[PDB]
Scaffold this active site. Structure first.
Site, PDB file in Angstrom:
ATOM      1  N   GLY A  25       0.797  -1.209   0.000  1.00  0.00           N
ATOM      2  CA  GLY A  25       0.000   0.000   0.000  1.00  0.00           C
ATOM      3  C   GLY A  25       0.832   1.263   0.000  1.00  0.00           C
ATOM      4  O   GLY A  25       2.014   1.245  -0.348  1.00  0.00           O
ATOM      5  N   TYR A  29       3.338  10.536   0.567  1.00  0.00           N
ATOM      6  CA  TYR A  29       4.798  10.659   0.511  1.00  0.00           C
ATOM      7  C   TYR A  29       5.519   9.482   1.200  1.00  0.00           C
ATOM      8  O   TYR A  29       6.432   9.666   2.009  1.00  0.00           O
ATOM      9  CB  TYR A  29       5.240  12.022   1.085  1.00  0.00           C
ATOM     10  CG  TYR A  29       5.403  12.086   2.590  1.00  0.00           C
ATOM     11  CD1 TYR A  29       4.310  11.917   3.441  1.00  0.00           C
ATOM     12  CD2 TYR A  29       6.655  12.313   3.162  1.00  0.00           C
ATOM     13  CE1 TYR A  29       4.461  11.974   4.825  1.00  0.00           C
ATOM     14  CE2 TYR A  29       6.817  12.372   4.542  1.00  0.00           C
ATOM     15  CZ  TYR A  29       5.716  12.201   5.367  1.00  0.00           C
ATOM     16  OH  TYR A  29       5.872  12.261   6.733  1.00  0.00           O
ATOM     17  N   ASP A 142      -3.028  11.535  17.573  1.00  0.00           N
ATOM     18  CA  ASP A 142      -3.750  11.104  16.379  1.00  0.00           C
ATOM     19  C   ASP A 142      -4.233   9.677  16.493  1.00  0.00           C
ATOM     20  O   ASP A 142      -4.009   8.858  15.601  1.00  0.00           O
ATOM     21  CB  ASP A 142      -2.891  11.261  15.131  1.00  0.00           C
ATOM     22  CG  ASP A 142      -3.719  11.475  13.893  1.00  0.00           C
ATOM     23  OD1 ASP A 142      -4.926  11.751  14.017  1.00  0.00           O
ATOM     24  OD2 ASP A 142      -3.171  11.363  12.790  1.00  0.00           O
TER      25      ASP A 142
END
Ligand SMILES: Cn1cnc2c(NCc3ccccc3)nc(NCCO)nc21
EC number: 2.7.11.24
Length: 350
Positions: A25, A29, A142
């Site tokens: 995958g 970047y 996150d």
């Protein structure tokens, strides 16, 4: 081909150690590939990183490398190796080798329903890792299903510390509607009101969102934009009380909340019917509007809901708090590349 390897275009080396390259995958970047740690005879995971072009891409890359290399926990992905040129001049990209995992909570939740036994164990692992992370004075910032990798043994590992920060509760306030980079849906309410996201409670709110999504296979607060996110949260928790509003001294935020029509709390067992009662009680404490009343990581681990796993002597904490000798973000793209070069030096022979 006569030197570096090409996978669906673009180069992707690993030297004379990682073979059997297999696309895994991408994302942004960076290109991922499973391979073969010829030394360990296992198929590792390799992420191709090239941030030296964008200055910010460089800082996210640095703290991710710094944090991960200094951390060591069963529920936090590690950095087994890092592949880069022998010279800083020749270094265009950097490869990070990590234990391969079968999937992530995001993909899993996309098709497989979770059993309570599965939800309990996943939460316990999310929190066990978080206690270690928070014990190092670090905030992930996150936390969301896509940042939680699992293998076929159901073992969970927190990953993606690109946006991680060293806690700083004293310098957390800010004006109403202050922009943020972290994934919207799992953003705490105070982020849209007057928080910089420099307190540990920001992580706990996220975990609460993950708990809910694991219970329903759908995002609890899928706000379409920045302010809609808050509107989503308030539709379920109801209008904040007087006390909660008092904590908010920032006038703009307070007046916004006050200009709103009152709405009552939407019961949890009504949102998630055939869901464990103890779980919903922990979910409640996690998704607490006032950051100060929000349950803390160690507190959450000791909740009756995780009783079958709770064992404080088996829930490690870091050897010592974390700190980045920059703190304030601002730092040149060159230097960063130099720091990244030395931070990856330990994996280079001679
Ligand atoms: C550090 N790391 C370890 N295992 C994996 C993994 N394992 C399985 C996998 C393959 C493909 C998609 C999702 C998961 N996938 C990815 N990222 C691919 C982008 O999603 N990184 C990993």
């Amino acid at each position: 081909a006569a030197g570096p390897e090409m996978v669906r275009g673009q180069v992707f080396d690993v030297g004379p150690r990682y073979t059997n390259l297999s696309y895994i995958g991408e994302g942004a970047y960076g290109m991922v590939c499973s391979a073969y740690d010829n030394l360990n005879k296992v198929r590792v995971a390799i992420k191709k990183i090239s941030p030296f072009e964008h200055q910010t891409y460089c800082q996210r890359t640095l703290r991710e490398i710094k944090i991960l290399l200094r951390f060591r926990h069963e529920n936090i992905i590690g950095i087994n190796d890092i592949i880069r040129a022998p010279t800083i001049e020749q270094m265009k990209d950097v490869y990070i080798v990590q234990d391969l995992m079968e999937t992530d909570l995001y993909k899993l939740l996309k098709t497989q329903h979770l059993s309570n036994d599965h939800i309990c164990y996943f939460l316990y692992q999310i929190l066990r890792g978080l206690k270690y992370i928070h014990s190092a004075n670090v905030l992930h910032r996150d936390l969301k299903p896509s940042n939680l990798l699992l293998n076929t043994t159901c073992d969970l590992k927190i990953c993606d510390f690109g946006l991680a920060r060293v806690a700083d509760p004293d310098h957390d306030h800010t004006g109403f509607l202050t922009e943020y980079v972290a994934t919207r849906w799992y953003r705490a309410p105070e982020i849209m009101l007057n928080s910089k996201g420099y307190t540990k409670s920001i992580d706990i709110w996220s975990v609460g969102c993950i708990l809910a999504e694991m219970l329903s296979n759908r995002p609890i607060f899928p706000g379409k934009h920045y302010l809609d996110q808050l509107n989503h949260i308030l539709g379920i928790l109801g209008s904040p009380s007087q006390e909660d509003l008092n904590c908010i001294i920032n006038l703009k935020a307070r007046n916004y909340l006050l200009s709103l029509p009152h709405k009552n709390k939407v019961p949890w067992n009504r949102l998630f019917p055939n869901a464990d009662s103890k779980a919903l009680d922990l979910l409640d404490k996690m998704l607490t509007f006032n950051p100060h009343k929000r349950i803390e990581v160690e507190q959450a681990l000791a909740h009756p809901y995780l009783e079958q796993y709770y064992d404080p002597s088996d829930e490690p904490i870091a050897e010592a708090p974390f700190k980045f000798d920059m703190e304030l973000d601002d730092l040149p793209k060159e230097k960063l590349k130099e720091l990244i070069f030395e931070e990856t030096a330990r994996f280079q022979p001679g």
